[PDB]
Amino acid sequence: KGPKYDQIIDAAVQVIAEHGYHQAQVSKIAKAAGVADGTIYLYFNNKEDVLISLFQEKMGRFVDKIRSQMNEATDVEEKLKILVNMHFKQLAADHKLAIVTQLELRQSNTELRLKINEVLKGYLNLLDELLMEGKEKGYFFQELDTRLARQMIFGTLDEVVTNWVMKDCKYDLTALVKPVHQLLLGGLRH
Amino acid sequence: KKGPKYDQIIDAAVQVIAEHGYHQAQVSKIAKAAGVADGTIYLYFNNKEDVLISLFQEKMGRFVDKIRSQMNEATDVEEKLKILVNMHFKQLAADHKLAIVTQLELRQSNTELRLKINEVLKGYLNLLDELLMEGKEKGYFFQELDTRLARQMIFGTLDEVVTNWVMKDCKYDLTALVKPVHQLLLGGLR
Amino acid sequence: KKGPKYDQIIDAAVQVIAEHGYHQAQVSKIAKAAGVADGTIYLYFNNKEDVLISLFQEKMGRFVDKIRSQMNEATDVEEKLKILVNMHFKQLAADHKLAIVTQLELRQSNTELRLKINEVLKGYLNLLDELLMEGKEKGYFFQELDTRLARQMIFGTLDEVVTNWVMKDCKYDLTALVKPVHQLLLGGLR
Amino acid sequence: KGPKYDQIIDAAVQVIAEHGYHQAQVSKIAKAAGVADGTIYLYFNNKEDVLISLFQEKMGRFVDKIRSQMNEATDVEEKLKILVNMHFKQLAADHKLAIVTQLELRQSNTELRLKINEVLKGYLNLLDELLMEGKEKGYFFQELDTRLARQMIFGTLDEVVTNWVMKDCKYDLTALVKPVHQLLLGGLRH
DNA sequence: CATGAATGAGTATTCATTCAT
DNA sequence: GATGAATGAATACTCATTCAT
């Protein structure tokens, strides 16, 4: 909405990344944004609204940037390949946000996460939309359950990423694109 | 011995956390559920957290063993993998309250509970590593395959499928998804 | 600046501890006595103990400085001792609530409050050492006198007299006991 | 009374001297007495009675041992001499009790300490007896306020002793007897 | 638009005491 | 008389949210 809306959201990322979720009270977020406590409530109406809006904004930029890149290739093998690239690229490009989103937000309470889960519905559409365009043009098993095939895909990508942050980003995440991508299409078999 | 009140308390804790949440499971509430006084809890446990540790150890400390128990009743590696999915899903489908506790409510930890959960988790992860290396060494799986990467695919997929089934309050039959998930892990999307 | 609420708290705490005791002066009770919310207390203080310490410091941290400044207005060393007794008794007789809190209530502390009291107490012991050394260096007190033992006799005599006065509910003139006490510390029983 | 009555009181001294006052729960005292927690209530009314009785029993002996020793004397300042001597000798001969009395009981709530000095009036009366006897036979000056001179003597002896335990009995308490005594009779002057 | 001082609900844990056996 | 398992009352501190300037 306003110009402080972005100072706050970006502060919340940098407050949570450095201090951790349970050490990110409103006042610590405020001081990092150069803003008073009650001013937070002029731009958001909850601590929860701050956290969800953080996710919505960052997720919107995330899915939009991916769908943009897939719009070029017309062929569903590369569309998956591009997805895996872009997913890993964006997270490798911002370690701080990765920490907040893969680690500290996991330490949330339960209905903040159910809300975060609703924000993920957008990405899961892009996945499910890909999985049905791969069935009609017959790139995938033509009796594929898309609900499950989506969950295998996100589950894998999210696990591989989460383990990358717990190792403190020691290794080149994007170097794993080809092996992960090849795994999703082919499976474990020889 | 431990006496009936020990079991009473762990049972009470499981279902309280399951109806109310991790952050709404005050000790008095658990004690009322167990039919004992607040201070009686501390005659069987050190902390509230020791209740939460014992809970996870009793209810999930044989989880991996049980999977291992049935995998050993099969020769073919690809069937072992299927049994692994089947026993992973069967055990969680068999206790809805526990499924809610361990997949949702109790992942919000960062304390010693987080330590103890990772002990059990690690055990599950080596069984995956062993199954993968066996399927590897014996030509079931392609050999340029990376174990730690394939391990993250399998667990990422299963845990995702499970957590989704829990968020939709255990409606659909999780055990019916064993066969579809299995052939996805083996033969990929293509 | 500390702001008006600072010593509203410090004062109200004296009143509560003097009327209920060290063991029944809860934060909420002090808070209401000060006319502020419980949390507001922690805006001007760190702990309950920081309150007790700040209480003792303000109310008793100039106790020795004050005695000292009246002793300076005398040249006779025996007259300085009479002034010391007079000023010791004067200050406590002038604040019955602070006397109850200091002689009976804050004694039973075991923590850092005790460290800060021993600081204030030690300075007083120094003043007694200092005086006693002047006395025997100039022939007022007998040459073979032990300072630490004499410091112990004086303090113990004053402390006992003050304490019994506080326990008989402060209802007899304390300062009227200066002359006989002073005469006893000088001439003994004979 | 009973046989366990004495085991309990002695265990109370042992626990309090070893763990301090704030770590002397009834269970610890029962365990040192070789009895059950509930057995203590077959001999005392409560934990406060255990403490009061402990003082009564130790005080009663302490006063009699002094009283009978003075009965074997003629001169009154010779009686004051054995008082200071026997007072210091009984405390010097039982260190762990002297920690309980001079240290740890001072850390108790006030309205138990006010029960402690009702016990003490027996001893104080003994002093009042000595002081008035000394007045008649002309041993002391005779507008001596016995009520006040009582508070000097006890106040001194107690402070001298309390400092001895504050320093782990690093020095011989009994070598102080006549330096202390001389002070009581002769005061500070040459 | 912005401030930041005030608010006040919420909770794990200890321990003296009881009573069924 | 002895037991000891069970009881339950009692209390400091945090932090998201407001509202008076």
Side-chain angles (χ1 to χ4, degrees), chain A residues 2-10 35 39-40 42-44 57:
Chain A
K4 318 194 100 174
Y5 186 89
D6 301 341
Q7 300 181 63
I8 293 161
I9 275 179
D10 185 42
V35 143
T39 304
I40 292 293
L42 286 175
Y43 286 86
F44 314 77
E57 288 284 356

Side-chain angles (χ1 to χ4, degrees), chain A residues 86-103:
Chain A
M86 295 301 147
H87 190 127
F88 283 7
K89 243 168 199 172
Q90 302 193 69
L91 269 39
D94 194 21
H95 296 177
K96 282 208 276 162
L97 183 72
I99 294 156
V100 173
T101 190
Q102 310 299 146
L103 271 55

Side-chain angles (χ1 to χ4, degrees), chain A residues 25-26 41 46:
Chain A
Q25 311 85 347
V26 177
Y41 287 75
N46 258 338

Side-chain angles (χ1 to χ4, degrees), chain C residues 94-109 111-136 138-151:
Chain C
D95 202 326
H96 293 193
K97 273 179 295 167
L98 186 59
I100 288 170
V101 162
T102 289
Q103 308 303 136
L104 304 189
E105 300 295 336
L106 258 48
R107 301 297 199 160
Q108 57 181 292
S109 69
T111 49
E112 188 200 343
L113 179 58
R114 207 65 193 86
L115 299 203
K116 297 321 204 208
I117 295 173
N118 288 348
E119 279 186 358
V120 176
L121 177 59
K122 184 66 191 180
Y124 187 42
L125 299 184
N126 296 334
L127 182 66
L128 284 179
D129 287 339
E130 214 161 336
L131 171 70
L132 285 162
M133 292 185 298
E134 198 164 286
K136 57 181 182 180
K138 294 178 179 184
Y140 293 87
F141 307 147
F142 62 93
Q143 181 66 14
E144 39 279 30
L145 171 70
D146 186 52
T147 298
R148 209 183 207 95
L149 198 73
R151 175 227 293 163

Side-chain angles (χ1 to χ4, degrees), chain A residues 72-137:
Chain A
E72 311 314 89
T74 43
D75 218 349
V76 190
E77 79 288 4
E78 332 177 13
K79 288 182 187 292
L80 174 66
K81 164 79 176 190
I82 290 160
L83 166 92
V84 176
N85 209 313
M86 295 301 147
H87 190 127
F88 283 7
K89 243 168 199 172
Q90 302 193 69
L91 269 39
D94 194 21
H95 296 177
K96 282 208 276 162
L97 183 72
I99 294 156
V100 173
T101 190
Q102 310 299 146
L103 271 55
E104 304 281 13
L105 276 185
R106 302 256 177 275
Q107 293 175 45
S108 308
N109 55 305
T110 280
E111 19 206 331
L112 175 57
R113 285 181 302 184
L114 289 172
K115 287 179 181 66
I116 277 176
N117 186 244
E118 253 280 337
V119 187
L120 279 161
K121 174 204 187 20
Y123 190 26
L124 301 183
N125 289 337
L126 177 54
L127 283 177
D128 184 358
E129 244 165 357
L130 181 64
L131 289 173
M132 291 181 297
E133 291 301 281
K135 285 213 293 179
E136 301 304 297
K137 310 188 18 172

Side-chain angles (χ1 to χ4, degrees), chain C residues 3-18 20-109 111-136 138-188:
Chain C
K5 288 184 177 63
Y6 174 87
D7 53 332
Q8 284 178 27
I9 291 159
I10 283 190
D11 190 73
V14 174
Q15 289 145 13
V16 173
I17 302 179
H20 295 103
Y22 177 88
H23 47 276
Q24 294 292 344
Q26 306 88 345
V27 168
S28 73
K29 186 174 289 177
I30 302 177
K32 193 191 92 195
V36 292
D38 299 34
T40 313
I41 289 181
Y42 296 82
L43 270 169
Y44 298 102
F45 301 92
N46 307 333
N47 326 272
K48 189 187 186 184
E49 282 212 356
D50 185 39
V51 174
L52 299 185
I53 286 170
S54 301
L55 187 158
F56 186 85
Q57 259 152 9
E58 296 285 0
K59 290 295 160 189
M60 284 290 182
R62 267 172 291 247
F63 185 89
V64 179
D65 165 24
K66 194 181 280 195
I67 295 178
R68 193 157 201 134
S69 67
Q70 294 307 317
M71 286 178 64
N72 300 142
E73 308 274 5
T75 176
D76 192 274
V77 169
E78 285 193 16
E79 183 66 14
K80 286 183 189 293
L81 182 52
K82 175 172 160 194
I83 290 177
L84 178 137
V85 171
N86 186 48
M87 284 297 295
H88 185 139
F89 285 3
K90 204 95 181 301
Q91 291 183 80
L92 284 151
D95 202 326
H96 293 193
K97 273 179 295 167
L98 186 59
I100 288 170
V101 162
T102 289
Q103 308 303 136
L104 304 189
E105 300 295 336
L106 258 48
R107 301 297 199 160
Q108 57 181 292
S109 69
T111 49
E112 188 200 343
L113 179 58
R114 207 65 193 86
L115 299 203
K116 297 321 204 208
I117 295 173
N118 288 348
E119 279 186 358
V120 176
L121 177 59
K122 184 66 191 180
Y124 187 42
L125 299 184
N126 296 334
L127 182 66
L128 284 179
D129 287 339
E130 214 161 336
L131 171 70
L132 285 162
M133 292 185 298
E134 198 164 286
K136 57 181 182 180
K138 294 178 179 184
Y140 293 87
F141 307 147
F142 62 93
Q143 181 66 14
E144 39 279 30
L145 171 70
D146 186 52
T147 298
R148 209 183 207 95
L149 198 73
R151 175 227 293 163
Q152 254 142 122
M153 174 221 188
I154 297 178
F155 180 81
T157 300
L158 303 182
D159 197 352
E160 185 70 24
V161 165
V162 167
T163 286
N164 286 289
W165 168 78
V166 175
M167 289 187 305
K168 285 177 91 183
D169 195 3
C170 293
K171 293 314 174 135
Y172 61 80
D173 197 341
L174 173 72
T175 59
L177 294 177
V178 167
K179 173 65 183 183
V181 164
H182 170 62
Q183 265 292 0
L184 267 170
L185 284 176
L186 283 184

